[PDB]
């Protein structure tokens, strides 16, 4: 007849904030595929490779509360001249040298990784709104080749 | 010549179980995303959130065995008044207040976290089925700002 | 000479049926763009939107084995009151309250969405098939704005 | 008799406004192909191609509620110094260089990317309209060959 | 006043050339209807239908460059004694068997699927040119019903 | 030399059919443009526009097979009694209200849209024969303006 | 015996409109064919070629609720300095430059291509109108070879 | 005045290469739908479902580095007796036996599932190259139902 | 002023090796959730469940210094008979008897846990390399339900 | 009746400080996985490995009382020329000799490992926030295999 099992576990991931929007469930953890680079791109140190575009989704906005959102985003620089630069880290072995990523914001501007040099201000309407980025590959020297991987925090500002 | 290094660990986790339909490797343990929450969408008792969806999978279902299935989910309830919202939990400092995480069935009811009143049946078919749920944030009075992870187990009734 | 680099990774998805007809691959995931609609359309409970139209292809259909096929659709209704309505869930803020999406068969009839109601049932040819229906917003109350996700998984009775 | 199987899964994408008119389903998300350009035509700054059309449909317009709708677009600019040009984002390799694309609403003017400056303001009548705009490249320089995609939001103001 | 909502997205595509042409935006990915077929056309070895035409457009072509282009398809083979048959695609169930696509350039013979064999050339004039290209459907034994779609991409080479 | 550039892509489309007659590709996937219609003339249940010709155009047929061919049609009917009433899609927003599309055969008898109801039969010729058919609009009731798209499929018969 | 098999996919495009005419089938998309002229025809700022006729033909007209009809224009515009004249599109490449596209109503007067400036009123008789435009070429400078394709909707005021 | 709240993670993956070519970001983890095939045409050794096209698409090719590009897949076979045949995995439960795998290069014949054995070599163009691959069904007996999901890594050799 | 408290501690696990690769720090230590699977599966001596995948990856290859690698599992064995069958571990209570887990290299074989007996050869290059390997259950009975936990450590011998 | 048996025991671990800001439990005693790194790569002094991320999330911040935050590293050195180079141990056998751990702040820079030389400080919004950090090995001769294990104590600076 009835048979009851056990079945399994579940985890809910969020965070209350008091703001006047509300980042989606999308963007609170999301992977920016880059794909691939050659090393010819980042021959030399300033060069850079093509761009990925990502985005990141507020909900709920309230335009009565504030009208603008930027973004700062923090992470390990590769070095202490290269503060606009993101380290490479997935493992101790195996990951590209002389090269880090960079996060663009909506001017088309390198954001300094300190998590306190916010975007440049978006204007919001009510409602959903997306805060466009991209991504790329700077070259600090002769880039040789590996894994390409990298991690960043963001905090959102709203005046 | 031949090289030989040790390499590492490989933990299985698995579960054998007499009964209809198996868990999928999925839906065993998983973390759902519910994203940001504004304060202001939880300003008083009875506030909830929007919703986010969720499924558990199970496989290998034989409906000559069980022909439906429910779920029953367990939990530390936020306090004795609320027996269907799930208390927070990560850490001793900066969760939210006042806050809860709710799960649903497919018929859009909060269910009781005592893991013995099963959500509404669903017809099961051969092989795959996928039963629906949501998770959304209930307010149990005015929401204070912070971190809002919540766990819980399930299990599963065949008849 | 021949220069190998690691490229990457490929995911194939599907599934083997015992039918006499096979789901086709661009409809077991497909999405549905619904567009925009207005508050004013859906001010009170009952209010309906415009409908905007999707198949289900079924491919191989050997009408020896079956001569009809039927689809039930299993979600999250919005409430215990609306059983033909499904719930909204994209995240926990930002989504429209007092909406769901309504699911309506051939005949222009709403499904309920338990799993287990089945569509009108629709002669069957030889090869190709492709069976109708349309997806309207159905107001609970009076609408408020926001994004308006759902999603419903559907199985198929072959007669 | 009857066999029942799994199907597979719909998603429904959309938005509640409240606003004169709703955004059509075809513009909501839309994909403009450009074709091909050459260099040679793309040889210096301030170059630009030939131009592509494409329209973004506004459906249910009420005239009592708005008489004119403009549209503002955001996404990332190519520099500092082009704030009316799109920035290029496909993959980490392969796109052109010193190209972007610039959008010009029913003015002939390319609208600047910062999600705040509208288009001309166009004359609704009731029921469907259709605003027209056309998106052709422009090189900030001696353009070079590659793949020459780009992404941006719009919102949309009634007055 | 002016209210403001969130609109929908954009997507761009094209590309930059260094070529003496460019590919037109309407030729860059078209879809050819070739209709039905009996099994009857197709009862052996060998059998072809009637043909469908597909032009691909050249615009800004500049004869000082180059006088001659010349076009090379690439797809997947039926199989290794059919190189110039393409394989059939859309869905691991309900296609045709035994029967593929074969691409007749303007001289009426099948092109090899490899990528790397160019049509007959054609002579340029400068401005728009439009070479003209047949889709047939060829058995490779008594074809059996189904859907019989394919995909191949294209390469212009300029003399 | 020569200069190579990527090109673009094709897609063919097409069906094998065991049938003594082949749909034409031009019929396979047809647009037909029934043009506006006033309120005026769709202003009570039962009222009927004016009619708009399409043909189903059949070929290579060979009446040694079958002398006869019919046509049904399968869409979205507009409420459970009017199954001969096609409904509107196009979009969540916009569309007329009350209305629907009627499908007719040779007779002028409007067709039941349930994918089982044939047409009257008409007699084939050997090689091409062109199937007649009309659409009108159909008020339900009193008629709203707004857009008034609509789609079928069909499937031929051979007797 | 009898054999059926899938026959395709019918379109159906229409609109629903309170006014006191309707516009015919063959009005409400049309393509003028305009042919050539050359660029010794267009030479400078002001230049002009020969017109083009088209119609705009009004159905089903009630002189009781109106009279007169006019009609407005609405595309992209060429640039500022000139309003009244179309700004071509087909791609990226190989589009004439320095012309537009001008429409003329039965005065012989170019419109404005705002969508909000009707041309000359046009009195009207039951049942069927017609109303006569022209479209010509207009140089804004020194005309150079390409294709020179343009589109614009219109709307019809009826008083 | 500006309040600052914790937004979120954005994890970066991408891969600096030594090579004439850089796989696209599409194409570095994709996912490919096969759809539904049923039992009744995998029911013997040997039998072969329906194909599903997929692609590698390459960006920045330099065919001054090289001019030919293969590729090779790595992943379980299903048995020792079919190196080409990819097994199945999701979970421990459901999946079907006696199916696996199979991917086709653009000759049609299956690859051998090791990583070391090439697929026929494609010449390439500089720039944007799309290698085309299919995936479909074998059955290396009578195939049962169940979940047929499968994974494989490839490889990119350039010569 | 600053205020400091003791804040935590850090472990960092590792292992320096001479050989041709690395082992990713995603591999030395990895969870392989099978889910659940039915005793109905596992009813008799050799009875095996549907497979999980796993990888083990390898960073920073130098082909120059080996060409191929290969994975050996050691663990606990379930008895004499079956030493390619893993025996579960958990706790003293509570496991499934008559199970174990059988992990399976490239070929579908399944590994002798003794640590000696090495997977097939695979064909490394340059950087990343990705070994696939499978882990199912395996019955030496009729099983009965019960945790089923397993662990197995591996070592990688390169040539 | 009841049956009641002694269960066993629950140890917690935590700590109550002064201070702007709480340290997350996950963050208190964490492992940080650093893989395999070759001694090919650590062969002279100076050589270091790749990275790998961790991170120190504080919890509950409260920017009234501190808007920064800084940490500092206490661990024994590996010698008294490397006072950034954390020494190995696990166990009086088996580790790699002439190598340690370097753990790297923000800015990419190595931290001196007294306990008392601070990272450089992160500005701090309300509620959560994340101190990445870095770790890698550090060759202070030609590195030998073995395991590299280490610990180290950290604290806390709000200012």
Redesign the interface.
């Known amino acids: 007849?009835?048979?009851?099992?056990?079945?399994?576990?579940?985890?809910?991931?969020?965070?209350?904030?008091?703001?006047?929007?509300?980042?989606?469930?999308?963007?609170?953890?999301?992977?920016?595929?880059?794909?691939?680079?050659?090393?010819?791109?980042?021959a030399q140190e300033g060069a850079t490779?093509?761009?990925?575009?990502?985005n990141?989704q507020l909900?709920?906005?309230?335009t009565n509360?504030?009208s603008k959102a930027a973004?700062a985003?923090?992470?390990?620089?590769?070095?202490?001249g290269h503060?606009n630069v993101?380290?490479?880290?997935?493992?101790?072995?195996?990951?590209?040298t002389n090269?880090g990523?960079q996060?663009?914001?909506?001017?088309?501007?390198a954001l300094t990784?300190?998590?306190?040099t916010f975007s440049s201000e978006?204007?919001l309407?009510?409602?959903?709104?997306?805060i466009?980025?991209?991504?790329?590959?700077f070259a600090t020297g002769a880039?040789?080749?590996?894994?390409?991987?990298?991690?960043?925090?963001?905090?959102?500002?709203?005046?």
Chains 1, 2, 3, 4, 5, 6, 7, 8, 9, 10 share one sequence.
Do not use: M, W
């Open positions: 007849a009835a048979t009851t099992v056990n079945g399994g576990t579940v985890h809910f991931k969020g965070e209350v904030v008091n703001a006047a929007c509300a980042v989606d469930a999308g963007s609170v953890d999301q992977t920016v595929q880059l794909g691939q680079v050659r090393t010819a791109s980042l490779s093509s761009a990925v575009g990502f990141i909900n709920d906005c309230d509360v504030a973004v985003f923090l992470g390990t620089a590769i070095d202490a503060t993101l380290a490479l880290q997935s493992s101790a072995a195996g990951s590209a090269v990523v996060i663009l914001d909506r001017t088309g501007a990784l300190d998590g306190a978006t204007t309407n009510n409602g959903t709104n997306t466009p980025f991209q991504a790329r590959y880039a040789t080749p590996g894994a390409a991987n990298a991690d960043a925090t963001f905090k959102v500002q709203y005046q």
